[PDB]
Design a protein around this ligand. Structure first.
Ligand code: HEC
Ligand code: HEC
Ligand code: HEC
Ligand code: HEC
Length: 107
């Protein structure tokens, strides 16, 4: 796989800007985040050709909002998903990882 960027990449969602650091995610299998596509390893931007590059839907596989939060049972493992289990480790962090605001996601 490509060389993991030691720098965080901005994820200009709908309006608010959120940057995700890889360092803090250098112990989590890529797949874990970079799910497979048609059983074909890929690493295209969250919003790559025929992917999640439409925040005008709000709900749908063509949305980068229902695959970012969705802390429910999804095909893969959403962010808020994992973070969910994490909170089960540092109950005193139920926000920094799962915070709508005043967090490391929504400052
Ligand atoms: C990282 C740990 C996040 C936490 C915690 C929360 N959100 Fe978030 N949010 C995140 C990203 C990376 C983005 C960019 C675009 C996307 O949808 O992934 C967002 C964006 C939003 C948006 C804008 C999208 C839209 O539908 O207009 C909203 C409204 C939003 N986030 C709300 C929200 C709430 C209510 C949260 C607490 C449950 C929350 N976010 C947590 C990443 C992260
Ligand atoms: C979630 C905890 C992740 C893990 C684990 C890894 N990466 Fe990642 N990567 C993540 C996000 C949220 C993004 C961009 C978000 C967006 O909306 O664009 C990325 C982006 C990359 C990129 C750039 C293009 C792309 O594939 O999106 C590369 C080259 C990349 N990531 C590499 C990479 C590798 C090699 C990983 C395993 C060692 C890896 N990432 C894990 C989130 C996450
Ligand atoms: C195009 C090559 C894609 C890119 C880039 C990413 N994903 Fe994706 N994802 C893609 C498809 C075609 C589908 C449909 C699922 C199916 O049943 O075939 C998905 C699905 C997801 C899901 C599950 C859907 C849900 O219930 O919300 C999640 C959680 C998801 N994708 C996350 C995700 C993230 C975070 C990405 C960037 C880091 C990402 N995908 C890139 C195709 C593509
Ligand atoms: C488990 C499989 C995870 C998934 C999926 C995602 N993240 Fe995560 N995140 C995880 C851990 C264990 C931690 C703690 C940091 C550590 O030392 O391991 C985090 C932290 C973050 C942070 C804060 C970074 C910090 O300095 O504490 C952010 C902003 C964050 N995570 C964002 C994020 C996004 C946007 C994800 C989906 C694209 C995502 N995480 C997935 C574990 C996991």
């Amino acid at each position: 796989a490509p060389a993991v960027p030691d720098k965080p990449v901005e994820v200009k969602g709908s309006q608010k800007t959120v940057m995700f650091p890889h360092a803090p995610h250098e112990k989590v299998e890529c797949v874990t985040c970079h799910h497979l596509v048609d059983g074909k390893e890929s690493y295209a931007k969250c919003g790559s050709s025929g992917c999640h590059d439409d925040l005008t839907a709000k709900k749908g596989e063509k949305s980068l909002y229902y695959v970012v939060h969705a802390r429910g049972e999804l095909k893969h493992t959403s962010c808020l998903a994992c973070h969910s289990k994490v909170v089960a480790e540092k109950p005193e962090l139920k926000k920094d990882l799962t915070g709508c605001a005043k967090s490391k996601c929504h400052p």
